[PDB]
Amino acid sequence: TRPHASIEVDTSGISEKVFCLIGQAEGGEPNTVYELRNYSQAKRLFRSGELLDAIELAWGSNPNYTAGRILAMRIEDAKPASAEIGGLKITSKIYGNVANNIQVGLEKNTLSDSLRLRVIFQDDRFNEVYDNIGNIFTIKYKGEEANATFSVEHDEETQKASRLVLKVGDQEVKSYDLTGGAYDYTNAIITDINQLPDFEAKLSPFGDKNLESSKLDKIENANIKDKAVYVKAVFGDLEKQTAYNGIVSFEQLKTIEPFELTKLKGGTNGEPPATWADKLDKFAHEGGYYIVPLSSKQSVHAEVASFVKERSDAGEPMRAIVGGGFNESKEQLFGRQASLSNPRVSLVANSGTFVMDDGRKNHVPAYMVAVALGGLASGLEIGESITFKPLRVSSLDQIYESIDLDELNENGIISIEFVRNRTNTFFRIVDDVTTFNDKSDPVKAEMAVGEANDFLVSELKVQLEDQFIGTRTINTSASIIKDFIQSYLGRKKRDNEIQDFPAEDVQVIVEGNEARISMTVYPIRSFKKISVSLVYKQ
Amino acid sequence: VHAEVASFVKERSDAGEPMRAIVGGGFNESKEQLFGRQASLSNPRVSLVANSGTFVMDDGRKNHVPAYMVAVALGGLASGLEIGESITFKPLRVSSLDQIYESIDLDELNENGIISIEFVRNRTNTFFRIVDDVTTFNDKSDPVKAE
Amino acid sequence: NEIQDFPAEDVQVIVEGNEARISMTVYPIRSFKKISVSLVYKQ
Amino acid sequence: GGAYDYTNAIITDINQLPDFEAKLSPFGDKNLESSKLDKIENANIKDKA
Amino acid sequence: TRPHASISEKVFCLIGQAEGGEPNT
Amino acid sequence: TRPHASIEVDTSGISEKVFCLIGQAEGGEPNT
Amino acid sequence: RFKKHVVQHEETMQAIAQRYYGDVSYWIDLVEHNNLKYPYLVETDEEKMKDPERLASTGDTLIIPIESDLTDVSAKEINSRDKDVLVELALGRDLNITADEKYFNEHGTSDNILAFSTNGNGDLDTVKGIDNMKQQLQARLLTPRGSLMLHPNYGSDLHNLFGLNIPEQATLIEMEVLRTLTSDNRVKSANLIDWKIQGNVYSGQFSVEIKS
């Protein structure tokens, strides 16, 4: 429409990597991934429960750092609530039990010979009415023959509108095809009746209808001299009335009929699924890096762990952080670690409490502290560690203290340590050790070193690919490979992505069908032991 | 009709005129359904494409694409490239694709002469590239027909 | 300053003997007609 | 001997008598030479695989 | 084996004990 | 190793031309 | 004016006072500002059940004065009333005239736009705190500078600015927006995050530092 200015006081939010969450929550259409870029969008795609409280925690676990964009999936096969009432299939755009609260009714107005529609739903405070359903336009004939009429005939094969005809007595004054032609939008009828001498036709003032002409209903020989009768077209008007808004949709089985204000049925979240792998398959190509399942079940932890290894074999590195239960014992934890001792997995012990922004002092299980942790770890720049970073947790339901924070960490399980003051939340996380058994190798053992390796490796792969694997010519022997690789390493040292490298310790071997490469790099990783000595001259 | 195209390309080859056909198969085909096509479409100069995905068309619409049309993406690529250049590892510009097949699957599809697609992760960006310039031909020691 | 820009690479030209033909793209200058501000809060 | 020396040919051609079915293992590549199979008889089939 | 990335003229002789490698070669 | 700090009040403080002594003392393995 | 705080695990009451005032000894004044009994903070949340209003626990919110209002008995009295609603004293309460943000955003700079409305029943809709601040920026900026019938130099020059779509003009719109928004003391400052010139649509987004 016309020129104007707008100011929206946007409530959105009340950055490089991507974070993946699969869990249980009671809204959103099932078995399709979503990208969440805004908390206020998550409150509207979803509604309630762990998947949303997880996201509300992930984007707030530190006062300065925060997680990137989040990929979500719901772990339920929620049906949509629906009913067959009248001649209409009513189906709700909401999927789950919540949709059962919806109410729909219809009543016919005597003063306009049309329907009045009402839809109600409680939790969104939605309760609005649509009226004058049909009434799409009126005709009055003005010639002085005794009594004239019009007619509108269907396509009997399809129940679509076929002709509109004007009859003065027995004579067809005029007619128009409606199975497509000139008149596919109703606008051309609104000229081509008026332009004749003996007839005039005019629209209702309540909005621009201008429907597709094939949607009229079958009528024959309706008087329009004594009255300015409506053309009806009651079903197809519902789309113009309500399609773009609200919670409900309508579909036809048959004649539309009034009915009392009635509830829907069949909104069902269903049984929880016995396995998560079939839905976990969908994250395979959405571009994630860090993934957390929102459940303590051991089968889910084994499936996700095997899934991450399968992705890592296929050119996509990934890492899983997992928690377990409500305040687990050492025996349980080392039982979970021993069954799951592969790399690219990390296990978290504690179960905390968080001040959720509703004012809701939420006591929160271990697999949700894993979200708070994974969120922070995902948001930081590549090559930093969670090592000695603080977390904004309120209090802990915990056993483990300083001597246990040898035992657990030494066996490759992460835990949060209580420091009595000044460090922002009194709580910092001791290490970034993984679930792998052998700690001697730092790439396997310590998360941050792996997280720097995985993206550095991908870049070496991608840059070697188009320079050489493209096979542009064999006439480029191994001496040139040393030139390209030393140039490549020289950039990484300059860009701080590696600490340093020796240039004259590179060996290349080639046989025309295959080239072999050897190189050394000196890595960059967080300090962890500081031994500062004192001496004096007395 | 694929067999007819294969017969046509063979007939033009006997006429002395070089031609090559690139062909796709259904939606959500399994390895074995594609092996059935591969065996029934045996001769060289015919190139079988695997997966069915989506492309962002002129409209800005999320158009669903069968393998019959995904074949066009490689055809438009091989005709654009310089003569003698390999189609291998060039980008493919695909929005979403039924592409669960893994690295070991790529070796099985490639060895059997079926063109496949791969997901690859850069530093932060991602892209999809085509993993080998192989044909539907059998012999591994005859690159004039196998590539 | 009568056109906002032109992607010079878009210009495509063909000649057919005693006639020729061109296609091009230009980004026109206009007045503003909708001003939209989004206003966001902190701390 | 001949075209059926590799079990892949039989994995294809059982699905050229489409009242029957054959389907591949998910657990990695196999490509077994069919002469290495072992002698078996009369396993009871319709529902079963 | 589809294409991929995976990540002095005076010769000197020796003969002795070792816990590995096939002998007589 | 656990990620931690450590501190010492050291005691091991109390030119090029190397200097040699030989004599008696109630300690050390002999001849070396 | 004041600052919020959130109580942490086994948080020492004296640590709060030290952490925000340097000396320990002002904790006597802080606990009087927050109407606490002797158990100033407690680990167990079941203990709060007995005297909820006069007993705080982990994750509860406390009010921290600034140093100048520390010993003022009147501030202590008022700060004992507005507990976790004190924002309302700075930003204020006013009548709602944004009856539908779906309406005026599609008509923009004109006469005959906004109107009083009613939330609930009988009580006229009063819009408060941050939601007052939303209105008092929005209703200000939509008004042209000369407009209002007392205290002129209200409003903004925004309606003048529909010139040619070229980059300089876009920065001129940024400048008038910045100028208009920093004109009220309730906001410390403003700055532009991003802008987007479509063929005839200006889009841009701005930060503002509301106080508290």
Helix/strand/coil (H, E, C) string of A290-319? EEEECCCCHHHHHHHHHHHHHHHCCCCCCE
Write out the two tokens for A288. 């994630």
Interface membership of B86 toward E (CB under 8 Å): no
CA C39/CA G177 separation, integer angstroms? 10
Of A407, A413, A332, the residue nearest A369 (C-alpha) = A413
Say if strands A199-202 and A219-223 run parallel, antiparallel, or are unpaired: unpaired
CA A272/CA A50 separation, integer angstroms? 14
How far CA G78 is from CA of F23, G82, G88, in Å, comes to 87, 6, 12
* Length of chain F in terms of residues written: 32
Write out the two tokens for C37. 């501000």
> Which candidate from A457, A469, A471 shows the least CB-CB separation from E7?
A457
Of A328, A405, A416, A414, the residue nearest A365 (C-alpha) = A328
| Neighbour-count burial of A366, counting CB atoms closer than 10 A to its CB (0-12 exposed, 13-18 middle, 19+ buried) | buried
| Phi, psi torsion values for G77, nearest 5 degrees | -65, -55
| Cβ distance of F2 and A405 shorter than 8 Å | yes
CA A83/CA B52 separation, integer angstroms? 36
CB–CB of A214/A186 below 8 Å? no
Q: What is the CA radius of gyration of chain G?
A: 23
CA G204/CA G208 separation, integer angstroms? 13
Sign for the CA dihedral angle at A236, A238, A243, A249 comes to: negative
Q: How many other CB atoms are there within 10 angstroms of residue G181's CB atom?
A: 20
**Contacts by residues G95-99 (CB-CB < 8 Å, ≥ 24 positions apart):** G95/G124, G95/G125, G95/G126, G95/G127, G96/G125, G96/G126, G96/G127, G96/G135, G97/G135, G97/G139, G98/G127, G98/G135, G98/G138, G98/G139
Percent helix, percent strand, percent coil in chain B, to nearest 5:
35, 20, 45
Write out the two tokens for G83. 């507990």
Q: Which residues of A186-217 are buried (b: 16+ CB within 10 A; e: fewer)?
A: beebbebbeeeeebbbebeeeeebebbbbbbb
| Cβ distance of A530 and F13 shorter than 8 Å | no
Beta bridge partners of G41: G56
* Length of chain G in terms of residues written: 212
CA A426/CA A62 separation, integer angstroms? 13
Phi-psi region for residue A278, left (φ > 0), alpha (ψ -120 to 50) or beta? Answer: alpha
Q: Indicate the DSSP class of residue A434.
A: -
Of A228, A226, A168, the residue nearest A196 (C-alpha) = A168
Beta bridge partners of F8: A533
Amino acid at A346: S
Amino acid at A162: S
As a whole number of angstroms, the longest Cα–Cα distance in chain B is: 51
CB–CB of G195/G180 below 8 Å? no
CA B29 to chain centroid: 13
CB–CB of A50/A294 below 8 Å? yes
Tell me how far apart the terminal alpha carbons of chain C are, to the nearest angstrom: 43
Query: H/E/C letters for each residue in E1-25?
Result: CCCCCCCCCCCCCCCCCCCCCCCCC
Interface membership of F8 toward A (CB under 8 Å): yes
CA B147/CA C5 separation, integer angstroms? 46
Sign for the CA dihedral angle at G57, G59, G61, G62 comes to: positive
Amino acid at B27: F
Ordered DSSP codes for A243-274: TTSSSEEEEE------EEEEE-B-----SPPS
Task: State the structure-solving technique.
Answer: cryo-EM
| Phi, psi torsion values for G46, nearest 5 degrees | -70, -25
Q: Which among B132, B135, B140, B141 is the top mutation candidate for probing chain E, defined by the most E β-carbons within 10 Å of its own β-carbon? A: B132
| Cβ distance of A528 and F3 shorter than 8 Å | yes
Interface membership of E6 toward B (CB under 8 Å): no
Beta bridge partners of A107: A116
Q: What is the CA radius of gyration of chain C?
A: 20
CB–CB of B31/B6 below 8 Å? no
Phi-psi region for residue A262, left (φ > 0), alpha (ψ -120 to 50) or beta? Answer: beta
CA G160/CA G147 separation, integer angstroms? 13
Beta bridge partners of G57: G42
Q: Indicate the DSSP class of residue B113.
A: T
| Phi, psi torsion values for A469, nearest 5 degrees | -65, -20
* Length of chain D in terms of residues written: 49
CA A419/CA A249 separation, integer angstroms? 56
Q: Which among B77, B121, B134 is the top mutation candidate for probing chain A, defined by the most A β-carbons within 10 Å of its own β-carbon? A: B121
Run of H or E including C14: strand C12-15
Q: Tell me whether chains G and E touch (3+ CB pairs under 8 A).
A: no
Amino acid at G193: I
Of A378, A451, A441, A373, the residue nearest A413 (C-alpha) = A373
Q: How many other CB atoms are there within 10 angstroms of residue G56's CB atom?
A: 23
Write out the two tokens for G57. 């626990």
Q: Tell me whether chains A and C touch (3+ CB pairs under 8 A).
A: yes
Run of H or E including G177: helix G167-181
**Alpha-helix runs per DSSP H in B16-121:** 31-40, 67-80, 103-111
Q: How many CA atoms lie within 13 A of A434 on its CB side?
A: 26
CA G58/CA G42 separation, integer angstroms? 7
CA G87/CA G84 separation, integer angstroms? 8
CA G162/CA G166 separation, integer angstroms? 11
Write out the two tokens for A64. 């300065």
CA A281/CA A283 separation, integer angstroms? 6
* Sequence-ordered list of residues with C-beta below 8 angstroms from that of B139, at least 6 positions apart, any chain: B145, B146
* Sequence-ordered list of residues with C-beta below 8 angstroms from that of G124, at least 6 positions apart, any chain: G95, G116, G118
CB–CB of A427/A418 below 8 Å? yes
Ordered DSSP codes for G11-75: --HHHHHHHHHSSSTTHHHHHHHTT--S--EES-STGGGTSSTT-EETT-EEEEE-GGGSS-HHH
| Phi, psi torsion values for A524, nearest 5 degrees | -120, 125
Q: Which among A310, A316, A466 is the top mutation candidate for probing chain B, defined by the most B β-carbons within 10 Å of its own β-carbon? A: A316
Q: How many CA atoms lie within 13 A of A475 on its CB side?
A: 0
| Cβ distance of E3 and B107 shorter than 8 Å | no
Residue whose tokens read 């007609």? C33
| Phi, psi torsion values for A337, nearest 5 degrees | -70, -45
* Length of chain C in terms of residues written: 43
Say if strands A34-36 and A69-74 run parallel, antiparallel, or are unpaired: antiparallel
Run of H or E including B9: helix B2-14
Amino acid at A369: V
* Sequence-ordered list of residues with C-beta below 8 angstroms from that of B56, at least 6 positions apart, any chain: B62, B63, B95
Contacts of B35 in chain D (CB under 8 A): 8, 11-12
CA B20/CA B1 separation, integer angstroms? 15
CA G26/CA B69 separation, integer angstroms? 76
CB–CB of A207/A130 below 8 Å? no
| Neighbour-count burial of A225, counting CB atoms closer than 10 A to its CB (0-12 exposed, 13-18 middle, 19+ buried) | middle
Say if strands A18-23 and A395-397 run parallel, antiparallel, or are unpaired: unpaired
**Contacts by residues G21-25 (CB-CB < 8 Å, ≥ 24 positions apart):** G21/G67
Of A13, A24, A25, the residue nearest A67 (C-alpha) = A13
Of A97, A94, A82, the residue nearest A46 (C-alpha) = A94
How far CA A209 is from CA of A239, A246, B26, G110, in Å, comes to 10, 19, 42, 28
SS3 D26: coil
CA A300/CA A276 separation, integer angstroms? 6
CB–CB of A345/A383 below 8 Å? no
Say if strands B126-130 and B117-121 run parallel, antiparallel, or are unpaired: antiparallel
Interface membership of B106 toward E (CB under 8 Å): yes
CA B95/CA B97 separation, integer angstroms? 7
